Amino acid sequence: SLFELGKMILQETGKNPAKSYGAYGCNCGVLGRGQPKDATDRCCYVHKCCYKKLTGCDPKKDRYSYSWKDKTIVCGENNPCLKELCECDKAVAICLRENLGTYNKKYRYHLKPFCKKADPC
Amino acid sequence: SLFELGKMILQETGKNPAKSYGAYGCNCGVLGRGQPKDATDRCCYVHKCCYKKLTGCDPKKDRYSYSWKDKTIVCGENNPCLKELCECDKAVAICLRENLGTYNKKYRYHLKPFCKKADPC
Numbered sequence: 369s370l371f372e373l374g375k376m377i378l379q380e381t382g383k384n385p386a387k388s389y390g391a392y393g394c395n396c397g398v399l400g401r402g403q404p405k406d407a408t409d410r411c412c413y414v415h416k417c418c419y420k421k422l423t424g425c426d427p428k429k430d431r432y433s434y435s436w437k438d439k440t441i442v443c444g445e446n447n448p449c450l451k452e453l454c455e456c457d458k459a460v461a462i463c464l465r466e467n468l469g470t471y472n473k474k475y476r477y478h479l480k481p482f483c484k485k486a487d488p489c
Numbered sequence: 490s491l492f493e494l495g496k497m498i499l500q501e502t503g504k505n506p507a508k509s510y511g512a513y514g515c516n517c518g519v520l521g522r523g524q525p526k527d528a529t530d531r532c533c534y535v536h537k538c539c540y541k542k543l544t545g546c547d548p549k550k551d552r553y554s555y556s557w558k559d560k561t562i563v564c565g566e567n568n569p570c571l572k573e574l575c576e577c578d579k580a581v582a583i584c585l586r587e588n589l590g591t592y593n594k595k596y597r598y599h600l601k602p603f604c605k606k607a608d609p610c
């Protein structure tokens with residue numbers, strides 16, 4: 369769910385998840401996808417394409433188990449859908465941290481309705 | 490559109506509109522409505538109920554004319570729908586400023602999917 373996703377992003381990046389990524393670019397946080405603005409945005413692009421296959425559970429609302437072990441996100445044992453969900457979230461958290469170097473605050477509260485349509489996943 | 494709305498909010502409050510009100514509570518900013526969390530949130534509740542009475546214009550993307558005269562938002566003539574839209578946005582901007590006293594930062598980046606369903610407008 370959003371709780372686990374936010375904790376992952378915080379653990380990896382060290383930044384307030386909602387504040388930095390809740391409305392970043394055309395892809396991060398709320399709503400769907402758009403053409404990515406930068407690398408950080410593209411993380412969330414891959415993120416939401418990863419969600420697409422999870423038709424068996426709710427990426428926003430369904431809780432799952434994971435642990436923070438030796439500064440590594442370790443997805444606990446779940447059902448297939450929740451396990452993949454956890455992996456989706458882990459991947460975007462890592463990706464967001466990897467791309468902090470080009471994080472641009474002008475995208476932080478990006479006006480998403482004016483984003484160009486995204487390619488099919 | 491979001492541009493005029495954000496500017497109105499800035500002119501009244503005068504806080505960063507996207508930052509304070511882009512994701513506030515269950516009603517402010519993105520997505521639809523939820524059961525309001527406080528007075529600020531209820532401003533946006535009324536705000537979105539106001540949008541439902543519009544007849545063919547796009548609240549998010551349609552530009553319209555207005556001016557900031559003697560520190561008062563004054564909606565330009567435009568066309569009937571755009572003027573109604575402009576009055577919707579003026580109303581929420583004033584209301585947001587009126588309720589700054591009880592603005593709660595805990596709601597600023599509210600996780601909206603866990604909001605309770607709103608009453609019909």
Ligand SMILES: O=C(O)/C=C/c1ccc(O)c(O)c1
Pocket residue numbers: 387594
């Ligand atoms: O982003 C932050 O870390 C805080 C920003 C901020 C800026 C002005 C305020 O009044 C406020 O409550 C919060």
